[PDB]
Design a protein around this ligand. Structure first.
Ligand code: HEM
Ligand code: HEM
Ligand SMILES: Cc1cc(N)nc(C#CCN2CCN(C)CC2)c1
Ligand SMILES: Cc1cc(N)nc(C#CCN2CCN(C)CC2)c1
Ligand SMILES: C[C@H](O)[C@H](O)[C@H]1CNc2nc(N)[nH]c(=O)c2N1
Ligand SMILES: C[C@H](O)[C@H](O)[C@H]1CNc2nc(N)[nH]c(=O)c2N1
Ligand SMILES: [Cl-]
Ligand SMILES: [Cl-]
Ligand SMILES: [Gd]
Ligand SMILES: [Gd]
Ligand SMILES: [Zn+2]
Lengths: 402, 400
């Protein structure tokens, strides 16, 4: 059992939960590959289902009971008859929460129990899918008082294709390859933008054009759906004391809603199950606006700030990035849209680790993703050793459907 | 062969050098422990391999001088059980241990290293003069030069040469009538050992500690460091005139003196090495870590920042100004220092060099990425592979 030290306080704990990791990651005793972004049959379906049913009945303080063994035999009977099985509603709710709880790269997991689960497993078409998605966005956005939510579409099943959302998030800004060779808008989204156009979207030419949705029903080409503008809540960016900042014309959207990941519960796979929370400000201020391969505004802000950009040792990059994050926090607070700064987020994650140590004997965590991209060692998670491993239920990456 | 991507550029390389990893790391397919700080005649195996390394590096594999050297180490171990490195090998192995250090961001410099051969040392008094030669050479009136001094290799039956201080320059840490510490809390322990062995404590928050030096099979001996030999930098800020009055200082020379150098199977428990500081080490970690000098709120009060809400980013603002003061102060004192933007950009160039030269480079992402402004640096966006190569610097137990 790995020993884990907090270097700020002196705390020492052991992660006994890692011993239960029943899927393998990319590291070996030869070489650690922890820094890599993408590090990745009825009997085996049965053993996954069995373990998850055990988890569920443990959670309802009913381990080993009549109802517990009843469900086991029921699931085996159904796999033997149909090749698969169906989750009960309460199991789907529990499994979606555990998948969030188990996500090693999520710093916001203190919230894991407060998750609205929308059961869309009856969804019939891409058009019904769109209506489900709009209701998710409306509920989650809640006029700026954001609420965590997931909508679960029908599971993968033999004999029919998958439901898929092609977009990586429900809200994304277009990225248009340009004049010279630049990108106008978000360079991360050049591919999905070109797919939308190919599928009949009439592009705009702004820097913050919200993308339409490409939604795939089983054994169907994807279908294009425009989001009503009044459903997509956005925040214009201003700075509390730098008045020229508003003239940058920058915006970001309220709702972070990941839509391209696969939800796995008890061996069943839901390739369409978009989930949303609220932003940590560094995601917007540091990564989305300052990454060199994203909006890349850092030098322009630093020039406007009259910083000396010809020498690195003036720390112009650091100073401009800090004020961009200030602008994000101030703008969302002004707009009354939920946001959490990286100091509050990491302190609440420390409490989650402590809650999880008592409840489960540990917590899977990916240090490089938990530590924020600015001011790392000023937050307490920097000084916390962590153990990264894969538990199920889980959210997993999956290939792009095109 | 692991695929390694740079997400800023989209470029891809493969790490073939990882296929040589000797000492196994702490990770398994089941769980990654990458964030954890501290995770007779088989001597011929590693000596053989190290000698082969040497002669390939000078393009002398499969030639007469190469075969000849293989036999002398054969005979030396057959006769005596251990072996002595040639001077050039001791030099080449020191530079390789540095080159192979996964957590070092300054390895672009690995080819420029001054090796002082103290292998004929024989007393704690001899050590002190060696250490003193190093410190004065490495400091060089503020034009810092990378240096390592290699004390004798450990042998069976006889004790070890050891430096009890973690570095050659450390500040004292004193407990109080209330537990809390005046000075550096990372050194409270070695501070209490120094006072135990007869050192008269100071009162200040930046008292340079004395050295506890350990000749084999003797108890340690205290040594006063020459004040004019410890170059220090008082801290001031270019525009915040009150920053000077906070009385902050730091020393010029980062000289790690508790690590064990391993070359060709041989083990040097006393082999202090030194370079120059990256400014975040001082400004962010040493001065702002909650368990170190923990000055962040004090600077924020002086800046009249809103410490009442985390969302003011008052910690971030104070931290950047402390780093600015470090860089400004060292530059004005003409003491070599490098900021984290320059350091990481040079490390990316090192990575490209090592890719063509050796097919990869062991790097510890969590330690290469600076502790402020991580994603503003290129190494944040660079995937890295961590593994152990030999020669190497290794951690070792405290000598008690
Ligand atoms: C409610 C507030 C939430 C906050 C503040 C938060 C915060 C974060 C942050 C900062 C990341 C890193 C993303 C990146 O750097 O690209 C992340 C990733 C992630 N979050 Fe959370 N999150 C929240 C809600 C949720 C919910 C509701 C779920 C699922 C039910 C979830 C599951 C995940 C997953 C699976 C990842 C990894 C995504 C990836 O690898 O690309 N999070 N979260
Ligand atoms: C020349 C300028 C150099 C710079 C700017 C530099 C920078 C750094 C930094 C910032 C660290 C991180 C350590 C920490 O944060 O605790 C480090 C670690 C390290 N460096 Fe360098 N370094 C330099 C030279 C050297 C030399 C000359 C050697 C040996 C010959 C060396 C060997 C190491 C080792 C072994 C570590 C790991 C220390 C540990 O694990 O505690 N470095 N270096
Ligand atoms: C639910 C949630 C809350 C929150 N604060 N952040 C995220 C995120 C993310 C990271 N995405 C992953 C997919 N990639 C294409 C874009 C970036 C998710
Ligand atoms: C050669 C070199 C150059 C440089 N810039 N930094 C280091 C370091 C370190 C890390 N120390 C290790 C000892 N511990 C007491 C404090 C932290 C080493
Ligand atoms: C290469 C490196 O692993 C990559 O840039 C990672 C590092 N840590 C991260 N952490 C978070 N939260 N989000 C990210 O996208 C990344 N990117
Ligand atoms: C807990 C965590 O692994 C630990 O604090 C590490 C992280 N990265 C680091 N990186 C450097 N350069 N120095 C350090 O001391 C640490 N500490
Ligand atoms: Cl995002
Ligand atoms: Cl230091
Ligand atoms: Gd102003
Ligand atoms: Gd004042
Ligand atoms: Zn690992």
């Amino acid at each position: 059992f790995p020993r884990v030290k907090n270097w700020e306080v002196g705390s020492i704990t052991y992660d006994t939960l890692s011993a239960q990791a029943q899927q393998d990651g990319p590291c070996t005793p030869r070489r650690c590959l922890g820094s890599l972004v993408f590090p990745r049959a009825p009997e085996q379906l049965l053993s996954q289902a069995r373990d998850f049913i055990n988890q569920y009945y443990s959670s309802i303080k009913r381990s080993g009971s009549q109802a517990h063994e009843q469900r086991l035999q029921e699931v085996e009977a159904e796999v033997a008859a149909t090749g698969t099985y169906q989750l009960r509603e309460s199991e789907l709710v529990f499994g979606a929460k555990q998948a969030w709880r188990n996500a090693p790269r999520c710093v916001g997991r203190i919230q894991w129990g407060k998750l609205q689960v929308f059961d869309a497993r009856d969804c019939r078409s891409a058009q019904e899918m769109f209506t489900y998605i709009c209701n998710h966005i409306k509920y989650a956005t809640n006029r700026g008082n954001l609420r965590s939510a997931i909508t679960v579409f029908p599971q993968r099943c033999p004999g029919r294709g998958d439901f898929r959302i092609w977009n990586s998030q429900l809200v994304r800004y277009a990225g248009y390859r340009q004049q010279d060779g630049s990108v106008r808008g978000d360079p991360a989204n050049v591919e999905i933008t070109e797919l939308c156009i190919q599928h009949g979207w009439t592009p705009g030419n702004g820097r913050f054009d919200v993308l339409p949705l490409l939604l795939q029903a089983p054994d169907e080409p994807p279908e294009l759906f425009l989001l009503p503008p009044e459903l997509v809540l956005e925040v214009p960016l201003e700075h509390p004391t730098l008045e020229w900042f508003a003239a940058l014309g920058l915006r970001w959207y309220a709702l972070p809603a990941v839509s391209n990941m696969l939800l796995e519960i008890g061996g069943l796979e839901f390739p369409a199950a978009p989930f949303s929370g609220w932003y940590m400000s560094t995601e917007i201020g540091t990564r989305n606006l300052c990454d060199p391969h994203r909006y890349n505004i850092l030098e322009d802000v630093a020039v406007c700030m009259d910083l000396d950009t010809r020498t690195t040792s003036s720390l112009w990059k650091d100073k401009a990035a800090v004020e961009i994050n200030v602008a994000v926090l101030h703008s969302y607070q002004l707009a009354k849209v939920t946001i959490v700064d990286h100091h509050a987020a990491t302190a609440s994650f420390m409490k989650h680790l402590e809650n999880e140590q008592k409840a489960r004997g540990g917590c899977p965590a990916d240090w490089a993703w938990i530590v924020p991209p600015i001011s790392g060692s000023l937050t307490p998670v920097f000084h916390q050793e962590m153990v990264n491993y894969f538990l199920s239920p889980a959210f997993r990456y999956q290939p792009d459907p095109w």
